[PDB]
Design a protein around this ligand. Sequence first.
Ligand SMILES: CO[C@H]1CC[C@@H](n2c([C@@H]3CCCC(=O)N3c3ccc(Br)c(Br)c3)nc3cc(-c4c(C)noc4C)ccc32)CC1
Length: 114
Amino acid sequence: IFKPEELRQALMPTLEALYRQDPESLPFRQPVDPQLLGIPDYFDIVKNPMDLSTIKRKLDTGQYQEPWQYVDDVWLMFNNAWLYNRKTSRVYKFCSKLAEVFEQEIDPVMQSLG
Ligand SMILES: CO[C@H]1CC[C@@H](n2c([C@@H]3CCCC(=O)N3c3ccc(Br)c(Br)c3)nc3cc(-c4c(C)noc4C)ccc32)CC1
């Protein structure tokens, strides 16, 4: 079993590594707001939205019981952006950069946590 403060200690540096990507992480620091962005179909397409602020709060409150639930939420964030945004868009290419960064940062941590 994984204690929530052990998960936070291990996993939150990989999340801070994503925040440190600037400007690539800027679209991802807060939930998508389809009203502000004038994209009324966003919630038609993205049925399980996720973003860095939601993941951070879940680490902060101990809502992950297992490290793979965290990894899954980060990838859900990525997949939502790749699904909604065109492959030529800045948000799409920024998402791809974040996934490259995350894949590096998460590998030694998950090796440690197993
Ligand atoms: C203060 O909080 C702000 C609120 C919103 C802002 N926002 C912008 C803005 C507005 C439009 C003009 C522009 O050019 N924006 C822009 C700004 C910075 C960068 Br970097 C980039 Br790229 C674009 N578009 C966004 C797209 C997403 C998105 C995702 C993920 N999945 O689907 C979508 C869709 C999410 C947030 C976005 C980011 C931060």
